[PDB]
Specification:
This is part of a larger assembly, with 5 copies of chain A. Chain A is about 25% helix and about 10% strand. By secondary structure, the first copy, chain A, is α+β, with helices and mostly antiparallel strands. It is classed as transferase.
Chain lengths: ~55, ~140, ~100, ~50, ~50
Protein backbone atom coordinates (compact mmCIF):
# COMPACT_ATOMS: atom_id res chain seq x y z
CA UNK A 1 0.00 0.00 0.00
CA UNK A 2 2.96 2.32 -0.73
CA UNK A 3 1.69 3.43 -4.20
CA UNK A 4 0.93 7.00 -3.18
CA UNK A 5 3.80 8.43 -1.13
CA UNK A 6 3.22 12.05 -0.10
CA UNK A 7 6.25 14.33 -0.64
CA UNK A 8 7.16 15.87 2.71
CA UNK A 9 9.57 18.42 1.24
CA UNK A 10 10.21 20.41 -1.94
CA UNK A 11 13.33 19.71 -4.07
CA UNK A 12 14.65 23.04 -2.75
CA UNK A 13 15.35 24.19 0.79
CA UNK A 14 13.26 27.22 1.74
CA UNK A 15 16.41 29.35 1.74
CA UNK A 16 17.12 28.21 -1.86
CA UNK A 17 13.57 28.43 -3.22
CA UNK A 18 14.02 31.79 -4.97
CA UNK A 19 17.44 31.01 -6.46
CA UNK A 20 15.90 28.01 -8.20
CA UNK A 21 12.85 29.80 -9.59
CA UNK A 22 15.21 32.32 -11.20
CA UNK A 23 17.90 30.09 -12.73
CA UNK A 24 16.34 28.42 -15.84
CA UNK A 25 19.15 25.84 -15.88
CA UNK A 26 18.79 24.73 -12.27
CA UNK A 27 18.22 20.99 -12.08
CA UNK A 28 17.99 18.24 -9.48
CA UNK A 29 20.77 15.78 -8.54
CA UNK A 30 20.80 12.78 -6.18
CA UNK A 31 21.91 13.88 -2.71
CA UNK A 32 24.70 11.97 -0.97
CA UNK A 33 23.24 11.79 2.57
CA UNK A 34 19.54 11.37 1.74
CA UNK A 35 19.88 9.87 -1.74
CA UNK A 36 16.75 11.73 -2.82
CA UNK A 37 16.47 14.35 -5.56
CA UNK A 38 17.42 17.90 -4.50
CA UNK A 39 18.76 21.16 -5.94
CA UNK A 40 22.40 21.82 -5.08
CA UNK A 41 24.00 25.21 -4.33
CA UNK A 42 26.71 24.31 -6.86
CA UNK A 43 24.36 23.79 -9.86
CA UNK A 44 22.28 26.92 -9.48
CA UNK A 45 23.63 29.59 -11.81
CA UNK A 46 26.80 27.63 -12.67
CA UNK A 47 29.22 27.99 -15.58
CA UNK A 48 29.12 24.24 -15.98
CA UNK A 49 25.34 24.18 -16.55
CA UNK A 50 25.76 26.85 -19.24
CA UNK A 51 28.47 24.85 -21.07
CA UNK A 52 26.63 21.54 -20.47
CA UNK A 53 23.27 22.82 -21.79
CA UNK B 1 2.89 41.48 -24.07
CA UNK B 2 3.02 38.61 -21.59
CA UNK B 3 0.78 36.46 -19.43
CA UNK B 4 1.78 33.56 -17.21
CA UNK B 5 0.46 31.17 -14.59
CA UNK B 6 2.65 29.44 -12.02
CA UNK B 7 2.19 27.05 -9.11
CA UNK B 8 4.33 27.39 -5.97
CA UNK B 9 5.80 24.37 -4.12
CA UNK B 10 5.06 21.44 -1.81
CA UNK B 11 2.76 22.51 1.03
CA UNK B 12 -0.38 21.78 3.06
CA UNK B 13 -2.01 25.22 3.21
CA UNK B 14 -4.19 25.67 0.12
CA UNK B 15 -5.18 29.30 0.77
CA UNK B 16 -1.51 30.32 0.99
CA UNK B 17 0.20 32.80 -1.41
CA UNK B 18 3.59 31.90 -2.86
CA UNK B 19 6.42 32.85 -5.15
CA UNK B 20 5.72 30.60 -8.10
CA UNK B 21 5.14 33.58 -10.35
CA UNK B 22 8.72 34.81 -9.64
CA UNK B 23 9.77 32.38 -12.38
CA UNK B 24 8.77 34.89 -15.05
CA UNK B 25 12.00 36.73 -14.22
CA UNK B 26 14.18 33.67 -14.55
CA UNK B 27 17.36 34.31 -16.51
CA UNK B 28 20.87 32.80 -16.33
CA UNK B 29 23.72 35.06 -15.28
CA UNK B 30 26.53 32.47 -15.23
CA UNK B 31 28.11 34.41 -18.12
CA UNK B 32 27.51 38.11 -18.75
CA UNK B 33 30.82 39.63 -19.90
CA UNK B 34 29.99 40.74 -23.44
CA UNK B 35 26.77 42.11 -24.93
CA UNK B 36 24.29 39.67 -26.44
CA UNK B 37 23.74 40.67 -30.11
CA UNK B 38 20.34 38.99 -29.67
CA UNK B 39 19.04 41.81 -27.44
CA UNK B 40 20.07 44.32 -30.10
CA UNK B 41 17.17 45.18 -32.40
CA UNK B 42 19.48 46.65 -35.07
CA UNK B 43 21.04 43.20 -35.29
CA UNK B 44 17.84 41.18 -35.47
CA UNK B 45 16.43 43.49 -38.17
CA UNK B 46 19.42 42.86 -40.44
CA UNK B 47 19.07 39.12 -40.00
CA UNK B 48 15.39 39.41 -40.96
CA UNK B 49 16.18 41.54 -44.00
CA UNK B 50 18.56 38.86 -45.21
CA UNK B 51 15.81 36.22 -44.89
CA UNK B 52 13.46 38.63 -46.68
CA UNK B 53 15.76 38.76 -49.70
CA UNK B 54 16.44 34.99 -49.40
CA UNK B 55 12.67 34.44 -49.64
CA UNK B 56 12.40 36.87 -52.53
CA UNK B 57 14.36 34.81 -55.05
CA UNK B 58 12.89 31.63 -53.62
CA UNK B 59 9.54 32.86 -54.94
CA UNK B 60 11.19 33.96 -58.18
CA UNK B 61 12.90 30.56 -58.41
CA UNK B 62 9.63 28.73 -57.73
CA UNK B 63 7.65 30.86 -60.21
CA UNK B 64 10.29 29.99 -62.82
CA UNK B 65 9.83 26.25 -62.42
CA UNK B 66 6.06 26.76 -62.86
CA UNK B 67 6.52 28.24 -66.34
CA UNK B 68 8.52 25.14 -67.30
CA UNK B 69 5.73 22.87 -66.05
CA UNK B 70 3.01 24.70 -68.00
CA UNK B 71 5.12 25.09 -71.21
CA UNK B 72 5.28 21.34 -71.68
CA UNK B 73 2.43 19.36 -70.13
CA UNK B 74 -0.74 21.45 -69.52
CA UNK B 75 -3.21 22.33 -72.28
CA UNK B 76 -4.68 25.70 -73.21
CA UNK B 77 -6.99 25.28 -70.17
CA UNK B 78 -3.92 26.61 -68.34
CA UNK B 79 -5.64 29.46 -66.47
CA UNK B 80 -6.60 27.46 -63.41
CA UNK B 81 -3.46 25.35 -63.31
CA UNK B 82 -1.71 28.73 -63.11
CA UNK B 83 -4.21 30.24 -60.64
CA UNK B 84 -4.18 27.36 -58.13
CA UNK B 85 -0.38 27.11 -58.27
CA UNK B 86 0.89 30.70 -58.13
CA UNK B 87 -1.69 31.30 -55.41
CA UNK B 88 -0.12 28.48 -53.41
CA UNK B 89 3.41 29.81 -54.04
CA UNK B 90 2.50 33.23 -52.66
CA UNK B 91 0.93 31.63 -49.60
CA UNK B 92 4.12 29.69 -48.83
CA UNK B 93 6.14 32.83 -49.52
CA UNK B 94 4.15 34.89 -47.03
CA UNK B 95 4.21 32.01 -44.57
CA UNK B 96 8.02 31.89 -44.70
CA UNK B 97 8.19 35.62 -44.27
CA UNK B 98 5.81 35.52 -41.31
CA UNK B 99 7.99 32.90 -39.70
CA UNK B 100 11.08 35.01 -40.19
CA UNK B 101 9.27 37.99 -38.68
CA UNK B 102 8.48 35.59 -35.87
CA UNK B 103 12.05 34.31 -35.41
CA UNK B 104 13.71 37.74 -35.21
CA UNK B 105 10.95 40.07 -34.06
CA UNK B 106 8.44 38.22 -31.92
CA UNK B 107 10.08 35.16 -30.34
CA UNK B 108 13.83 35.87 -30.49
CA UNK B 109 14.23 35.21 -26.76
CA UNK B 110 12.11 32.07 -26.47
CA UNK B 111 15.10 29.72 -26.80
CA UNK B 112 17.44 32.13 -24.88
CA UNK B 113 18.24 31.45 -21.13
CA UNK B 114 20.01 34.78 -20.72
CA UNK B 115 16.81 36.62 -21.60
CA UNK B 116 14.00 36.20 -19.07
CA UNK B 117 10.37 36.14 -20.28
CA UNK B 118 9.69 39.49 -18.56
CA UNK B 119 12.88 40.94 -20.12
CA UNK B 120 12.08 39.93 -23.67
CA UNK B 121 8.39 40.76 -23.35
CA UNK B 122 9.45 44.38 -22.98
CA UNK B 123 12.51 43.96 -25.22
CA UNK B 124 10.49 43.18 -28.37
CA UNK B 125 9.30 46.84 -28.37
CA UNK B 126 12.66 48.31 -27.47
CA UNK B 127 11.66 48.50 -23.81
CA UNK B 128 14.07 48.02 -20.90
CA UNK B 129 13.26 46.65 -17.45
CA UNK B 130 13.13 50.21 -16.12
CA UNK B 131 10.25 50.98 -18.50
CA UNK B 132 7.76 48.94 -16.50
CA UNK B 133 6.55 51.96 -14.56
CA UNK B 134 3.48 50.79 -12.67
CA UNK B 135 2.78 47.55 -10.81
CA UNK B 136 -0.89 46.80 -10.27
CA UNK B 137 -0.76 44.73 -7.09
CA UNK B 138 -3.42 42.23 -6.13
CA UNK B 139 -3.08 43.84 -2.72
CA UNK B 140 -5.87 41.99 -0.99
CA UNK B 141 -5.40 43.93 2.26
CA UNK B 142 -4.51 40.72 4.06
CA UNK B 143 -1.23 40.50 5.99
CA UNK B 144 -0.10 37.35 4.22
CA UNK B 145 -0.65 38.62 0.67
CA UNK C 1 -13.08 13.62 -5.85
CA UNK C 2 -9.57 14.75 -4.82
CA UNK C 3 -8.94 11.13 -3.76
CA UNK C 4 -9.90 9.86 -7.21
CA UNK C 5 -7.58 12.42 -8.81
CA UNK C 6 -4.70 11.79 -6.42
CA UNK C 7 -4.80 8.02 -7.00
CA UNK C 8 -4.86 8.36 -10.79
CA UNK C 9 -2.06 10.96 -10.98
CA UNK C 10 0.01 8.40 -9.09
CA UNK C 11 -1.12 5.48 -11.27
CA UNK C 12 -0.54 7.60 -14.41
CA UNK C 13 3.03 8.49 -13.48
CA UNK C 14 3.57 4.74 -12.87
CA UNK C 15 2.22 4.05 -16.37
CA UNK C 16 4.83 6.40 -17.66
CA UNK C 17 7.69 4.83 -15.71
CA UNK C 18 8.18 8.02 -13.69
CA UNK C 19 8.58 6.63 -10.20
CA UNK C 20 9.67 9.82 -8.44
CA UNK C 21 8.04 13.00 -9.84
CA UNK C 22 11.19 14.98 -9.02
CA UNK C 23 12.92 13.05 -11.81
CA UNK C 24 11.20 15.48 -14.15
CA UNK C 25 13.42 18.10 -12.53
CA UNK C 26 16.49 16.26 -13.76
CA UNK C 27 15.36 17.10 -17.35
CA UNK C 28 13.19 20.21 -16.95
CA UNK C 29 13.00 23.46 -14.97
CA UNK C 30 10.58 23.74 -12.04
CA UNK C 31 8.58 26.23 -14.13
CA UNK C 32 7.93 23.92 -17.07
CA UNK C 33 5.76 21.20 -15.53
CA UNK C 34 2.08 22.15 -15.56
CA UNK C 35 -1.37 20.99 -14.52
CA UNK C 36 -4.35 21.44 -16.87
CA UNK C 37 -6.74 18.86 -15.33
CA UNK C 38 -10.31 20.09 -14.89
CA UNK C 39 -13.74 19.37 -13.46
CA UNK C 40 -17.37 19.90 -14.45
CA UNK C 41 -18.61 20.54 -10.89
CA UNK C 42 -16.36 18.47 -8.57
CA UNK C 43 -16.11 19.32 -4.90
CA UNK C 44 -19.85 18.49 -5.02
CA UNK C 45 -19.49 16.96 -1.56
CA UNK C 46 -17.82 19.97 0.13
CA UNK C 47 -20.40 22.15 -1.62
CA UNK C 48 -23.13 20.36 0.30
CA UNK C 49 -21.39 20.73 3.64
CA UNK C 50 -21.25 24.42 2.88
CA UNK C 51 -24.87 24.97 1.76
CA UNK C 52 -26.78 22.30 3.66
CA UNK C 53 -24.70 20.88 6.52
CA UNK C 54 -24.07 24.45 7.69
CA UNK C 55 -27.75 25.29 7.37
CA UNK C 56 -28.40 22.51 9.92
CA UNK C 57 -25.60 23.63 12.26
CA UNK C 58 -24.06 20.18 11.73
CA UNK C 59 -20.35 20.00 12.45
CA UNK C 60 -18.56 20.89 9.18
CA UNK C 61 -14.93 21.96 8.58
CA UNK C 62 -13.90 25.62 8.51
CA UNK C 63 -12.42 25.34 5.02
CA UNK C 64 -14.91 23.22 3.07
CA UNK C 65 -14.81 26.24 0.79
CA UNK C 66 -11.23 25.21 -0.15
CA UNK C 67 -12.30 21.72 -1.26
CA UNK C 68 -15.37 22.73 -3.26
CA UNK C 69 -13.23 24.67 -5.76
CA UNK C 70 -12.70 22.97 -9.13
CA UNK C 71 -8.99 23.79 -9.05
CA UNK C 72 -7.98 22.59 -5.59
CA UNK C 73 -7.80 19.04 -6.91
CA UNK C 74 -4.88 20.14 -9.08
CA UNK C 75 -3.57 22.08 -6.06
CA UNK C 76 -3.36 19.04 -3.72
CA UNK C 77 -1.75 17.14 -6.61
CA UNK C 78 0.96 19.77 -6.82
CA UNK C 79 1.19 20.15 -3.03
CA UNK C 80 1.47 16.45 -2.23
CA UNK C 81 3.24 15.04 -5.29
CA UNK C 82 4.63 17.35 -7.94
CA UNK C 83 5.96 20.60 -6.42
CA UNK C 84 5.94 22.39 -9.80
CA UNK C 85 5.91 26.12 -10.51
CA UNK C 86 4.66 25.45 -14.03
CA UNK C 87 1.37 26.63 -15.55
CA UNK C 88 -1.94 26.00 -13.78
CA UNK C 89 -4.86 26.52 -16.19
CA UNK C 90 -8.02 24.74 -14.99
CA UNK C 91 -10.90 23.92 -17.43
CA UNK C 92 -14.63 23.82 -16.75
CA UNK C 93 -16.02 22.04 -19.78
CA UNK C 94 -19.04 20.31 -18.21
CA UNK C 95 -19.53 16.94 -19.94
CA UNK C 96 -16.42 17.59 -22.08
CA UNK C 97 -13.90 19.21 -19.73
CA UNK D 1 -5.71 22.93 32.86
CA UNK D 2 -4.16 19.78 31.33
CA UNK D 3 -7.54 18.01 30.82
CA UNK D 4 -9.17 21.16 29.40
CA UNK D 5 -6.34 22.12 27.02
CA UNK D 6 -6.08 18.49 25.85
CA UNK D 7 -9.78 17.90 25.15
CA UNK D 8 -9.90 21.19 23.14
CA UNK D 9 -6.78 20.56 21.00
CA UNK D 10 -7.70 16.87 20.45
CA UNK D 11 -11.17 18.04 19.33
CA UNK D 12 -10.06 20.62 16.72
CA UNK D 13 -7.77 17.88 15.31
CA UNK D 14 -10.36 15.06 15.55
CA UNK D 15 -7.98 12.47 17.08
CA UNK D 16 -8.25 10.81 20.51
CA UNK D 17 -6.31 12.40 23.37
CA UNK D 18 -3.92 9.42 23.24
CA UNK D 19 -2.89 10.35 19.67
CA UNK D 20 -1.89 13.69 21.14
CA UNK D 21 1.18 13.94 23.38
CA UNK D 22 1.21 17.17 25.40
CA UNK D 23 4.94 16.74 24.77
CA UNK D 24 4.50 18.03 21.21
CA UNK D 25 3.78 21.57 20.05
CA UNK D 26 0.78 23.09 18.21
CA UNK D 27 2.96 23.56 15.11
CA UNK D 28 3.74 19.80 14.95
CA UNK D 29 0.21 18.64 15.80
CA UNK D 30 -1.12 20.58 12.79
CA UNK D 31 1.53 19.59 10.25
CA UNK D 32 1.25 22.69 8.09
CA UNK D 33 -2.46 23.58 7.84
CA UNK D 34 -2.30 27.09 9.34
CA UNK D 35 -6.09 27.50 9.23
CA UNK D 36 -6.17 24.89 12.02
CA UNK D 37 -3.31 26.62 13.87
CA UNK D 38 -5.36 29.85 13.70
CA UNK D 39 -8.39 27.96 15.08
CA UNK D 40 -6.65 26.27 18.01
CA UNK D 41 -5.10 29.67 18.82
CA UNK D 42 -8.35 31.67 18.82
CA UNK D 43 -10.28 28.93 20.63
CA UNK D 44 -7.85 29.00 23.59
CA UNK D 45 -8.39 32.76 23.77
CA UNK D 46 -12.15 32.44 24.41
CA UNK D 47 -11.30 29.71 26.92
CA UNK D 48 -8.50 30.90 29.23
CA UNK E 1 16.60 20.45 -47.02
CA UNK E 2 17.22 23.64 -48.95
CA UNK E 3 16.65 25.72 -45.79
CA UNK E 4 18.94 23.30 -43.94
CA UNK E 5 21.79 24.04 -46.32
CA UNK E 6 20.86 27.77 -46.35
CA UNK E 7 21.23 27.74 -42.56
CA UNK E 8 24.48 25.83 -42.79
CA UNK E 9 26.52 28.56 -44.46
CA UNK E 10 24.69 31.19 -42.43
CA UNK E 11 26.39 29.67 -39.39
CA UNK E 12 29.66 29.40 -41.30
CA UNK E 13 29.24 33.03 -42.42
CA UNK E 14 28.47 34.17 -38.87
CA UNK E 15 31.37 32.20 -37.36
CA UNK E 16 33.65 33.90 -39.90
CA UNK E 17 32.69 37.40 -38.81
CA UNK E 18 33.43 36.38 -35.19
CA UNK E 19 37.06 35.59 -36.01
CA UNK E 20 37.39 39.08 -37.50
CA UNK E 21 35.97 40.64 -34.33
CA UNK E 22 38.35 38.75 -32.01
CA UNK E 23 41.44 39.25 -34.26
CA UNK E 24 41.30 43.00 -33.81
CA UNK E 25 39.63 44.22 -30.62
CA UNK E 26 39.55 41.57 -27.83
CA UNK E 27 42.56 40.78 -25.63
CA UNK E 28 44.10 37.42 -24.77
CA UNK E 29 41.18 36.95 -22.33
CA UNK E 30 39.40 35.84 -25.51
CA UNK E 31 38.12 32.49 -24.24
CA UNK E 32 34.84 33.76 -22.86
CA UNK E 33 34.22 36.31 -25.59
CA UNK E 34 34.45 33.26 -27.88
CA UNK E 35 32.41 30.98 -25.58
CA UNK E 36 29.48 33.37 -25.05
CA UNK E 37 29.34 34.24 -28.76
CA UNK E 38 29.71 30.93 -30.61
CA UNK E 39 27.28 29.48 -28.07
CA UNK E 40 24.76 32.14 -29.08
CA UNK E 41 25.38 31.51 -32.80
CA UNK E 42 24.62 27.81 -32.44
CA UNK E 43 21.44 28.60 -30.52
CA UNK E 44 20.19 30.87 -33.32
CA UNK E 45 21.24 28.25 -35.85
CA UNK E 46 19.24 25.51 -34.15
CA UNK E 47 16.36 27.91 -33.65
CA UNK E 48 16.23 28.66 -37.38
Amino acid sequence: NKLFVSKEHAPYTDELEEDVYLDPLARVSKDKKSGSLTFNSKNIQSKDSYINA
Amino acid sequence: AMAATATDKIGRSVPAPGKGILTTAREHHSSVKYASPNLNMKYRKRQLVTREAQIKDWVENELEALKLEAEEIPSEDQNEFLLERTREIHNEAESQLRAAQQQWGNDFYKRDPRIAPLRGALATYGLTIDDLGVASFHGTSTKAN
Amino acid sequence: ITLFVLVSVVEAFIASGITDPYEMYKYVHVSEVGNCSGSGMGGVSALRGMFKDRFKDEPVQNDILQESFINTMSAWVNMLLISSSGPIKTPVGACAT
Amino acid sequence: ASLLLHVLVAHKLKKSLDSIPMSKTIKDLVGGKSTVQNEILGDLGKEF
